Design a protein around this nucleic acid. Structure first.
Ligand SMILES: Nc1ncnc2c1ncn2[C@@H]1O[C@H](COP(=O)(O)OP(=O)(O)OP(=O)(O)O)[C@@H](O)[C@H]1O
Ligand SMILES: [Mg+2]
Ligand SMILES: [Mg+2]
Ligand SMILES: [Mg+2]
Ligand SMILES: [Mg+2]
Ligand SMILES: [Mg+2]
Ligand SMILES: [Mg+2]
Ligand SMILES: [Mg+2]
Ligand SMILES: [Mg+2]
Ligand code: NA
Lengths: 177, 79, 114, 152, 66
RNA sequence: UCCUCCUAAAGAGUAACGGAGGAGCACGAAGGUUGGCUAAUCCUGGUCGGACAUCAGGAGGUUAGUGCAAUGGCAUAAGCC
RNA sequence: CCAGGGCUACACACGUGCUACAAUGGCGCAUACAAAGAGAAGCGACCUCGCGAGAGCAAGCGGACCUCAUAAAGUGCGUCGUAGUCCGGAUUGGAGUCUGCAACUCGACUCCAUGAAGUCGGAAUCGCUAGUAAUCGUGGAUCAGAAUGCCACGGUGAAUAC
């Protein structure tokens, strides 16, 4: 949306001068957003996973992909094929539409918001963030929902380092400390 | 809870507190005034109050100003 | 009908529905209607949605269920960490106002465990 | 011997029924005139009579399905009514299976276990629950409606 | 998109009490009114107004009216 | 009675009341074909979440997998949809 | 002899009580009918201030005159319409008044908020034959302050005894 051309018109020029880039497109860019939540206790009951899937489809207008256990582990008593959690990945336009409304309404609605930590990068330039609450998004009316299941936001950028990854997210007015 | 006026402390504690602040931190004061309220000038001291058998060292911090000296000295043992 | 948390109870007089807010009792309830121009006898489902707006802001001047739980929590938590005598009685789960524990005080001790 | 037991959820305390005057009759002389009634939380109230006098039409309008010319039946504040009709065939339709049919009736228990046990407690083997719920016969149709009120 | 297996996704008008009228695409079905957005959220000026819990010495000193 | 390895001396075969393990089945798809896909284990970052669930990157390379014991095999996959 | 602490400690058990579980009851407004008793480093009118505990000035009374001191159930109107509720009042946080050198261990009371167990109680067991049982209020002793206990006073007032 507006964030996309804002990136084209401002962020590219902001980062080109800062890091002394020689080519136009060597500046990093975000390529996808991955949303999930592993309900886990859906081992006992099935209707929780269908409820979580309805939440993710409300937060982002896509049907979540149900994910199943990769290997049987006796610690939590699960086996291969058991659906454990959902997953949604956003690319292109729908990525920006969710991204713009994450940084502008959802995060400011966090109860006792103090600031998102800037040391959450995975060592290559990608950002991961928990939310602990699915009510901060306006698409939840607090009455349909029953549980307090949290999401897991992942920012997959093409940055070669977290030093560049921090700068790219900062140029989008990301609430770091 | 005391009354409308006059946070009540004994002279001998108040007199001893005055000489305690003139030399910074010092040795703990061996006092018996459990009823004496903690004045703000007692912050940072290491007053020792009687619990019946043993003077216990209580280190007065900024948050203990409305309480009394014997309030931080348990006087009966359990388990 | 709808205040800070929820004014769910309908069919009830005004001075009773506002009692459902954690932080509003009875005299604090009557303070709202005295300055809101609404009589005590008035029903919640009968008053207009415009007067709900005036009810909302008067309640907001007090401290209610949201921030009052935090406000109370620090009051208890301060004593516990400070190591006061009342802090000890909060940790041990015994009455703090200096009363009997020989046979009574089942409210703080709880169910009888022999 | 199937092992069935019914347990409450809120257990109202004062009374359940409140009937003022029923005066319900289909196409002939009305089967009852007023029938002032009160239950008082218990009183298992065995309705009786020879067949054809309208004891089943009393219960059907006591639960609010058939509208009477009465003045309402005034259930309690938190009544959770469980119905076992004299004829029970509309429930066993749409070719749900034994496990499928039982599953939707629940409020807090889990879908895989704690409904297999309740369904399997009343004599339903492992291979008996993977067949359509409409092909059941007689007592098993009745036994389902006892299990229906187990989780409910 | 896989042809009507997803919820409806349209454009709504989300606005704040202090303005902040920003058009967005969401799945609610009706416009939404909320508090101050990230533009006017006091996460960058109320820091001193946020860490203020406490105060006992000065409160007693007020009661020292003699 | 049948199957796998060693004794069995680099073709086949080769004994002992020699050393070790399995079978008396299963599947109407777990067969045929076409299209597509690639694991274990680790690190980092991430709400409940934890040594270990689900996710995002990187190392690794088949140390995974095969309805069933062992041997031989399998990336053109015989493994997974 | 003195200061501080204890007799107020709490996995637990018992005895005697107070308050409740409500609709012949809660709450608001108005309105009546008592007896007995105490008071001088004491009872302390009236008025003003404080929502209240009380504070300031302060007459009278060592008294059938003055103070404590309004008695309360009852009575009429309204509301609540069977809910853990407009029942219940524990526990806890905050802000205070007063007696006292001193209210932390441990005082009473008032205000704001919080508002729990309890929806008539197992085996067993207690009191009462008439102004009695049942309930409602009041005073006195001890006492600087500190009673649901003790001693006493009256109001309404039964059922049954073959
Ligand atoms: N829809 C109807 N139309 C006409 N008459 C009806 C209708 N339903 C019931 N009746 C008649 O009214 C009476 C009510 O009978 P109903 O079907 O309620 O069962 P019942 O009398 O309790 O019988 P049973 O003891 O055999 O179950 C009967 O005489 C019946 O014939
Ligand atoms: Mg050979
Ligand atoms: Mg050879
Ligand atoms: Mg030979
Ligand atoms: Mg095969
Ligand atoms: Mg192929
Ligand atoms: Mg094949
Ligand atoms: Mg002594
Ligand atoms: Mg004693
Ligand atoms: Na019938």
């Amino acid at each position: 949306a507006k964030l996309h051309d804002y990136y084209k018109d401002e962020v590219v020029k902001k980062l080109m001068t800062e890091f002394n880039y020689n080519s136009v497109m060597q500046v990093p860019r975000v390529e996808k957003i991955t949303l999930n939540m592993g309900v886990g206790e859906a081992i006992a009951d099935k209707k929780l996973l269908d409820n979580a899937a309805a939440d993710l489809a409300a937060i982002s207008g896509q049907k979540p992909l149900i994910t199943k256990a990769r290997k049987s582990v006796a610690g939590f008593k699960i086996r291969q094929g058991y659906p454990i959690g959902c997953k949604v990945t956003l690319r292109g336009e729908r990525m920006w539409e969710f991204f713009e409304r994450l940084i502008t309404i959802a995060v400011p609605r966090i109860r006792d918001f103090r600031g998102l930590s800037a040391k959450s990068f995975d060592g290559r330039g990608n950002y991961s963030m928990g939310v602990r609450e699915q009510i901060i998004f306006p698409e939840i009316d607090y009455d349909k929902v029953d549980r307090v299941r949290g999401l897991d936001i992942t920012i997959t950028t093409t940055a070669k380092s977290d030093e560049e990854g921090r700068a790219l997210l900062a140029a989008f007015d990301f609430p770091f400390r | 809870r005391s009354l409308k006026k006059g946070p009540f402390i004994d002279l001998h504690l108040l007199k001893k507190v005055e000489k305690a602040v003139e030399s910074g931190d010092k040795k703990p004061l061996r006092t018996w005034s459990r009823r004496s309220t903690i004045f703000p000038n007692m912050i940072g001291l290491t007053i020792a109050v009687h619990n019946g058998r043993q003077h216990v060292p209580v280190f007065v911090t900024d948050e203990m100003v409305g309480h009394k000296l014997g309030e931080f000295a348990p006087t009966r043992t359990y388990r | 009908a709808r205040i800070a948390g929820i004014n769910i109870p309908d069919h009830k007089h005004a001075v009773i529905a506002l009692t459902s807010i954690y932080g509003v009792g009875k005299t604090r309830s009557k303070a709202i209607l005295a300055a809101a121009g609404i009589a005590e006898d008035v029903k919640i489902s009968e008053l207009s949605e415009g007067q709900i707006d005036t009810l909302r802001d008067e309640v907001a001047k007090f401290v209610v269920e949201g921030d009052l739980r935090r406000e109370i929590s620090m009051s208890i938590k301060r004593l516990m960490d400070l190591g006061c005598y009342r802090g000890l009685r909060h940790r041990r789960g015994l009455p703090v106002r200096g009363q009997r524990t020989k046979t009574n005080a089942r409210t703080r001790k709880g169910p009888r465990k022999p | 011997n199937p092992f069935i037991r019914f347990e409450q959820d809120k257990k109202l305390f004062r009374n359940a029924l409140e009937v003022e005057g029923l005066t319900k009759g289909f196409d002939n002389g009305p089967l009852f005139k007023n029938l002032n009634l009160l239950l008082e939380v218990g009183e298992k109230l065995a309705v009786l009579g020879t067949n054809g006098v309208g004891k089943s039409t009393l219960l059907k309008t006591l639960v609010g399905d058939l509208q009477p010319d009465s003045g309402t039946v005034k259930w309690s504040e938190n009544a959770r009514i469980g119905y076992y009709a004299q004829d029970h065939e509309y429930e066993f339709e749409n070719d749900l299976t034994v496990f499928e049919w039982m599953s939707q009736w629940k409020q807090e228990g889990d879908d895989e276990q704690a409904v297999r046990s309740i369904l399997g407690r009343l004599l339903f083997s492992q291979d008996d629950i993977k067949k359509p719920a409409k092909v059941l016969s007689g007592g098993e149709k009745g036994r389902m409606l006892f299990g229906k009120l187990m989780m409910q | 998109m896989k042809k009507d297996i997803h919820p409806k996704y349209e454009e709504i008008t989300a606005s704040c009490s202090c303005g902040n009228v920003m058009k967005i695409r969401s799945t609610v079905g009706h416009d939404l009114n909320l508090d101050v957005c990230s533009k006017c959220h006091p996460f960058f000026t109320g820091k001193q107004r946020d860490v203020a819990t406490g105060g006992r010495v000065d409160r007693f000193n007020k009661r020292f009216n003699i």
